[PDB]
UniProtKB/TrEMBL annotation, chain B:
PROSITE patterns named in the record: PPASE
Sequence intervals crossing the membrane: none
Coiled coil: none
GO cellular component, as recorded: acidocalcisome; cytoplasm
UniProt KW keywords: Hydrolase, Magnesium, Metal-binding
EC numbers on record: 3.6.1.1
CDD domains: pyrophosphatase (cd00412)
SUPFAM superfamilies in alphabetical order: EF-hand (SSF47473), Inorganic pyrophosphatase (SSF50324)
Assigned protein family: Belongs to the PPase family.
Name assigned to this protein: inorganic diphosphatase
UniProt enzyme class: hydrolase
């Protein structure tokens, strides 16, 4: 991060005047006196190469060239053997073809196998080569991209505010054009990964799939039907009447993480177990999602609420499409860009049962929002409980 | 959209009753008395009233649902239809729990009346925490190992030894292999499961930065070398630089593309045996050899020595204004002067060295993104041909 | 007509560049390009801009002669010493009367006729290291007697009790003197710059909005119109702090200073004013503190009628918001913040049902008028405010 | 901030009770019993329960507030004390009602116990609606006319006749008057009533663009001409250009400044201070823009400081994230190196040497820069004086 600080800070005397054109052969080449032009101009070789109007003249090139020939002459004999001369050429960028090497060994004429820089220079200048790089290298690693790209398709069926309403999911295999129904809970991957991640290996991964169940600014209850086939989203209707949060509107997109399972058979701490449900999340971005809408989010932290022996996590995340997404690096950043947000979310979950005659909620850690790494470990563990729920059903 | 700003239907402003969901197959009804005395719709009551529906209220709603399944209008339902009602209401019912139900209602004539159903419904409440979870799914596999692109600097800058090499680190096994940024980095960046709307087109390419924003030292993908690392452009041992002035945008190239000499743009103009060129215009300077996802927006066409040299205009998907640039026509709205400047630079860069102004295609016009993507596609096809015509 | 230009093709005129002009229009003969230009196959102007070398004395000569000629309108082949001074003047050479008599002497056109040659000869021998010696002090002399004030807010009492109060003051930034003000009467409605540098072609839309109920809260705070210096206070009933029971207000909710809707001015038939300042809903992503003041851009208004009184709810946005620039009118909201107008309207349509009320009645069927409409409502409100002060 | 992230005090989690607000002047109380029975605090029931407080609850609460005015515990209030308590509990009394209640309650012993107060309270309901509004006001009339900057281009670009003229249009009268960009455009942009947070430092300056981003033709404020319009750098009739390459940021001046080190008359080679605006948006020649100062770079010409202030336009998408010079490499990596590189070498092209910097090339922070600007603003006031 002090890469930033390097820019602001002053520079050494190497960076203010510039250096010699270097050989690239290391301490294996003897540090030289700059060429005459640099010395007369009072500008370094590299600065003259980079910014003077005229290109280096032939005598200047010869100087630089002999500094690079000498550099291969490690035992300091004052000459090179034809084979080293081909190395030099390959190093100068002129990748020669077998025909050429012998052609050059030939034209150079090493009257004793000894090629002096002078002899080289003379050959080099009489055989210019317009390097359009005629041969192209196909050497690749060629890995197999064994994967069928899918396009999610979301269909509404039935009527909202009635028992018929359902949001269904499908996958259109792109390489085959064929459609298949899928479970948003079991089939949409939890982690969103690229085939070839080009972001710096340095930057860790944080891109999760979020399934919206309750739209920002709404209060009508919807949920993943973990009981129904292909687990489509269904509205919460009891006795033909739709249910709602009575406390007020959910002020952030509220939903769940696919391929996750918090089990009432796995403990958090004595007395506290899981709630037999995918982990929930609240994405705080500015845009309202539609019911059942799926979006890529970034996890930032998690709030934990314990109710009747069951740990009920609330993951705080944010849509990668949100203008401020790039500035939220961890939970601690929500307050700076979204002041009061964490506070409202916690209060909402602390008091929402009061309205219908219940009490304030009991949280874990005295209501602390743990940081992203912790939220990710919850999600990860949950992913595993989900993989176990899948295995225990296969055989059974 | 403007549906939100526009006026509302008198059915929306006052509210509506609680529908059954069985369509016109239910006789439109009168609101329940309580909704009448309140002067508030049933739905608004269900949604916003501080209280839950009283039992008498739930019965009238439940009654309408019941009667809706009574399509003939007998005034009762066969136990199979009653079973259909329970399902509809979200109550799982198996031959077991089922039989015990008709044992409880007892319609000595199979005629289950609403009062007899309601009666039974109210005497068998069940906390539906849904005990049986459905595993039914498409369960797709994914034999893939995500690869981490690793970039490494080798040698020394401003000298003939500098190179940027590339590798794939298998995130599952951890093993690392050397790859050609030219041949192995995909041109098209695609999601394994695309969650964005099918109505939304794809426009997401990998761009390889060769010359950084605000600099002028030349570097290029060494198409001639094994695994084509990035090498610096050194001639006779002296580094080379644009003398006209600095490249003011990250300038670079698209992997898996090739414009071939052996192909014509139009009579007289061939390809130029290089991967296609790109100028990414976002605000962030990229490092040499750096790879990023870009949105393509259009292209400038330059012809020299009967050869076509395209300059694809693009913008990193991370740039703050990326989402607002939709096509080439949007660049002047947000980056006024940008295109003008990029064209002017390419129009005159050879003059300080004694050359002349350049000649463009279309009189210097920026073809739009659709034309630009085709230029990328074709060039991608040329790459495939280029690749076959070798192993073979 | 600015996008298009940068995208579109260029005239031959532009792609080849042109001659250095006299800048005196038709009064000058179109000329043939200088030979050095012709030998290069590069326009004169491209050469001066991009060639590595500066123009030589002979090239300058040709350029300066075309200029000189330009002043010689009737082609006499010479100029009067009087016109020569003009040329010197045009070339950027500040000439004090001393210099002028000197030039008339030093050239010496014993017949008043000064040829280009005589002129050129004189120019070359009296080189002048410009450095611009004399500074011009001419200027308008706008004065600012008044002192810049800083709005300061102090809190008194305990929040959620009848004693809490948000008091307003103006601190003189020069004296340090703090003086209590009324958010309602003293904070300016329109935010004005001393010198607007923003483009004139851009209509102003910058207002001060006083926040009463912060985003995501439900405690009823209000500007105390009946108390002196109208500080913010909470609504209390029978000693208990009042809250919205319908649910939290989901946007920053407040009012516009210097506005007023009187119960004595009609709007429609049997439609009066709320007898309060105009209320506002600011939709940015950021929650303000109770009584925090902010510049917002107005986007439209929604009109609620209740008991023959109009209850305007203006939709605006903090200029500080990341998408503020993109919402130019009410129609943009559904495009950047979909659901927002729906939710705001739905909220006000039903917030009273919770406490046994009925759904609200709206004007224009709840359509959201545009910003032109909102802005007319606001200016009117300012005049009722100006009249409310005069009547009193 | 991190307060939002951190755990909460057990009292916050549980919920607090309805306070007297009179501060410690009220005896801390037990939650009324119906609050105890709900296992929900008094304030949570008031803010979140569906129903209003029951009459027995309101009474218990009104009695805690009433007693809180009875600071010496007499057990009753004198009738002058009742008015206040009424307002406090939320009842707008009016001169007519006060007299009326001082009678109606009729404290036939001057004592108004709580029970008497309460009995009166329940038999008398007043429709507040607030009939009288307060017009008390500071009345800080600071009348002035809004001036709108108006810019006009004259002549032909790339020739001696191109000028950019500036004007003020009084938005009241609508009459225009030619002004000078150097002398008349405010260096400090100030709100006559600043509503932004007082704890937030002022940092808003006008920037007059001379050389647009990505261009290399030279323009400058004509310090020698009346109304100092912007002219093009023309010499012997040929327009001048930077030969190193294009300026890659908008380059211009700060109005009302003067970089001189010196009488009673005129002077020469000195200009307003130099600024480099680094936003993504190009500005036309002569365009003016509010900017945020971020730091500065100093070149020593020949014993003379040639400062270049780094700044960003307030309209830029990343303005808000750049708080000081150290923030630029974080959002515009390479931007400062590049600005430094450009100034280090722009004279090599034509046979000159690399420039030398003060502080080895360090970019001083915003504080140091606004200081340089202020001295320059003062230096400007002295010029203004000397001559006039
Ligand atoms: Mg849960
Ligand atoms: Mg190419
Ligand atoms: Mg109002
Ligand atoms: Mg300076």
């Amino acid at each position: 991060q002090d890469l930033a600080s390097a820019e602001v800070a002053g520079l050494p005397v190497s960076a203010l005047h510039g250096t010699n054109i270097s050989t690239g052969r290391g301490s294996e080449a003897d540090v030289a006196e700059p060429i005459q032009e640099a010395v007369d101009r009072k500008v370094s070789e590299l600065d003259l190469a980079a910014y003077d109007k005229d290109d280096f003249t032939q005598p200047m090139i010869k100087k630089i060239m002999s500094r690079l020939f000498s550099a291969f002459d490690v035992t300091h004999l004052g000459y090179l053997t034809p084979d080293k001369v081909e190395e030099v050429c390959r190093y100068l960028g002129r990748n020669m073809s077998d025909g050429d090497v012998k052609a050059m060994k030939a034209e150079i004429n090493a009257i004793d196998g000894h090629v002096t820089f002078e002899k080289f220079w003379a050959w080099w200048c009489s055989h210019p080569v317009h390097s359009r790089t005629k041969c192209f290298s196909m050497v690749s690693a060629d890995f197999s991209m064994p994967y069928h790209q899918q396009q999610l398709v979301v269909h509404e069926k039935g009527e909202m505010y009635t028992p018929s309403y359902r949001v269904l999911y499908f996958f259109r295999d792109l390489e085959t054009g064929r459609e298949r129904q899928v479970s948003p809970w079991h089939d949409i991957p939890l982690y969103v990964r690229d085939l070839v991640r080009t972001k710096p290996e340095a930057t860790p991964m944080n891109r999760y799939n979020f399934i919206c169940e309750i739209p920002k600014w709404t209060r009508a209850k919807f949920e993943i039907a973990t009981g129904e086939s292909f687990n489509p989203i269904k509205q919460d209707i009891k006795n033909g009447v739709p249910r709602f949060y009575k406390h007020g509107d959910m002020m952030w997109n509220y939903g769940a993480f696919p391929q996750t399972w918090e089990s009432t058979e796995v403990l958090f701490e004595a007395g506290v177990t899981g709630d037999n449900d995918p982990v929930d999340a609240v994405e705080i971005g500015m845009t309202q999602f539609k019911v059942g809408q799926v979006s890529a989010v970034k996890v930032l932290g998690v709030l934990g609420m314990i109710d009747e022996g069951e740990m009920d996590w609330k993951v705080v995340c944010i849509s990668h499409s949100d203008p401020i997404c790039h500035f939220l690096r961890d939970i601690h950043d929500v307050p700076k860009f979204l002041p009061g947000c964490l506070d409202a979310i916690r209060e909402w979950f602390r008091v929402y049962k009061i309205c219908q005659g219940g009490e304030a909620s009991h949280f874990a850690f005295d209501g602390e929002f743990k940081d992203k790494e912790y939220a990710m470990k919850v999600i990860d563990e949950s992913h595993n409980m989900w993989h176990n729920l899948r295995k225990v059903n296969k055989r059974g």
